[PDB]
Amino acid sequence: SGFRKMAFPSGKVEGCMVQVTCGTTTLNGLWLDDTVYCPRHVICTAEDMLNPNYEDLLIRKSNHSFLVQAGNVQLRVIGHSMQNCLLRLKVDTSNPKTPKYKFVRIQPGQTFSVLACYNGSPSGVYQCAMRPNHTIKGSFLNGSCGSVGFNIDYDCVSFCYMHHMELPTGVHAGTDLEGKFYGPFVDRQTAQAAGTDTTITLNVLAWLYAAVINGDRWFLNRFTTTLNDFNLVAMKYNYEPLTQDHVDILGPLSAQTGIAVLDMCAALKELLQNGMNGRTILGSTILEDEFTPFDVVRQCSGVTFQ
Amino acid sequence: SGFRKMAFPSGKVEGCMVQVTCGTTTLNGLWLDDTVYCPRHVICTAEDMLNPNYEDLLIRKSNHSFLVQAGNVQLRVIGHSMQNCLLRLKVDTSNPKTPKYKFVRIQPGQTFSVLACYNGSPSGVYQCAMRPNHTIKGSFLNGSCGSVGFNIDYDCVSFCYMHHMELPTGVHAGTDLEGKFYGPFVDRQTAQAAGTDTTITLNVLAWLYAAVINGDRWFLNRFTTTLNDFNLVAMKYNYEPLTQDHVDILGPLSAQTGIAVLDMCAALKELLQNGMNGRTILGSTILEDEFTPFDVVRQCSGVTFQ
Ligand SMILES: O=C(Sc1nnc(C(F)(F)F)[nH]1)c1ccc(C#Cc2ccccc2)o1
Numbered sequence A, B: 001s002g003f004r005k006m007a008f009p010s011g012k013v014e015g016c017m018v019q020v021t022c023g024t025t026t027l028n029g030l031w032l033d034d035t036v037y038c039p040r041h042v043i044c045t046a047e048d049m050l051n052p053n054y055e056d057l058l059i060r061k062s063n064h065s066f067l068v069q070a071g072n073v074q075l076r077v078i079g080h081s082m083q084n085c086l087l088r089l090k091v092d093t094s095n096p097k098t099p100k101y102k103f104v105r106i107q108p109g110q111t112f113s114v115l116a117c118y119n120g121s122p123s124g125v126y127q128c129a130m131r132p133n134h135t136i137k138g139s140f141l142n143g144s145c146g147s148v149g150f151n152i153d154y155d156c157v158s159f160c161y162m163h164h165m166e167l168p169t170g171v172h173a174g175t176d177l178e179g180k181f182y183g184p185f186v187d188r189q190t191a192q193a194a195g196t197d198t199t200i201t202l203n204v205l206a207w208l209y210a211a212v213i214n215g216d217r218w219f220l221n222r223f224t225t226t227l228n229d230f231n232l233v234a235m236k237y238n239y240e241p242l243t244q245d246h247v248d249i250l251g252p253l254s255a256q257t258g259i260a261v262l263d264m265c266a267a268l269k270e271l272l273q274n275g276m277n278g279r280t281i282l283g284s285t286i287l288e289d290e291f292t293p294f295d296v297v298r299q300c301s302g303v304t305f306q
């Protein structure tokens, strides 16, 4: 029993974190086989950020412009290229600790673990959701760029995020491991700001199923609803519209608890309209949206507390 | 910026998790040097739990009664002893992945990271506080016994918890790595239940300092309070009494923000009496108590957003 925001064990990722220095700038890189990945803005100094031309800034660099440190070991750069917003440094050593891995581009609403790192040293791990507005509410200080997000599937690390910047509201933006940004953000200091966010409906529903699996039914009701009628209430409360695809995804959870998706939607609608009446769900006083249907099946018992 | 329940990177602990089987019971053990630690109740079958005599149950076991699996490798038991509520199995191999470590007994209110494990395979990591009532609100399913709690200090792993059982309210109980229980709990199936809990005052205060360090001051006020006057409000709201020691501990945070501890206490008192007025603190609608003063200094910027 219980329910917590759980991260994946971070060991396989810890063994891949290095430090990358270019001139006066240091940040984290990711060492897989004989390549180190890092934010290209490592090449930018104390004025470049405002309007950098990375093509131009990089052509002026040599292989020995870059200092890569794996622990106390110094790695030798023997090549470099730019891939979108990432630098790809080739090194003379292959990381013996490289896990089985892939690079994936995660969709909004999906969750992953972040290994916060400073000077190539892991300092903490926590679970994040990719917001509908393509930001994450992380916990990052100066020096955290190059910290990565990931999921672990059996023995395979699916890397899906690399940290690049903080936006004015204190939220965070970055790229996939191909260097393409999530959201309309760019790696330069501009007026860019997070667009308006919405609550992740599908995740709230999954979480309500987790609460039932864990034995709680107080918020249920005898009503049902249609998709369209639900979505009118959804938009009033700034929730993402529910789609048939989302209903389909909730099938396994619906089957395990014997509660129809649209009946759970009627429950949510009531909770949204009436509030929670001083009561809690899975220890929370608010409706949580950073657990996916996958996260619930992963964490919750396969048998429900009927 | 941002503020999240952050766990320590779990790598050093992952490399220490093994599987221990006795008869039909399997759970997790901790492999440090040539010793495996695990809950002694691994020796108990499908009726022993009710009223087991561990001395008697253990004397009937040989070294080969115990099956220890580190990955796919089988470790050979070459000795065993009981230490309080733990078994101490000596093995023919020394764990090459043993980190620098110590065993510590944590105090109520303090926090640590839990590596949830099943069949000796780490599955997740999350941050927990030791409640005043000596339980933790973990996330555990059948097979999680032997999962450990820890803090990491530089290169040193301070182990402080091993999981033994779930109590009726769904909360969790276990021991330090000397096998002594936290709380009045025992490793047998009885009517034992968590005593009444209280909110960890010192942690709520630390967290209010974190909110200020991160730039938020809305909840402050022009009032001050005495310890005694605060504690009268504290007991009305089921908060731990504040002591001079707790005030002393909050010194560094108080200095960084320029807010007197007793002035922060007046703020808390107002928040307790008036509520939060639909507003949030560090993204929370409630007063959080699972971050210590240490956790705040670790996670927050050393310079405040004045
Ligand atoms: O702490 C951070 S994140 C960070 N700051 N430095 C690093 C390093 F690259 F790792 F060194 N990482 C921070 C502070 C301020 C900002 C910013 C910003 C910003 C806001 C709006 C538009 C463009 C840029 O990020």
Ligand SMILES: O=C(Sc1nnc(C(F)(F)F)[nH]1)c1ccc(C#Cc2ccccc2)o1
Pocket: A001, B026, B027, B028, B140, B141, B142, B143, B144, B145, B146, B164, B165, B166, B167, B168, B188, B189, B190, B191, B192
């Ligand atoms: O899922 C768990 S924790 C757990 N259950 N099994 C293991 C194993 F040892 F790892 F195998 N760990 C569970 C379910 C039910 C209980 C219990 C209980 C209990 C409640 C009151 C008094 C004494 C015992 O714990």
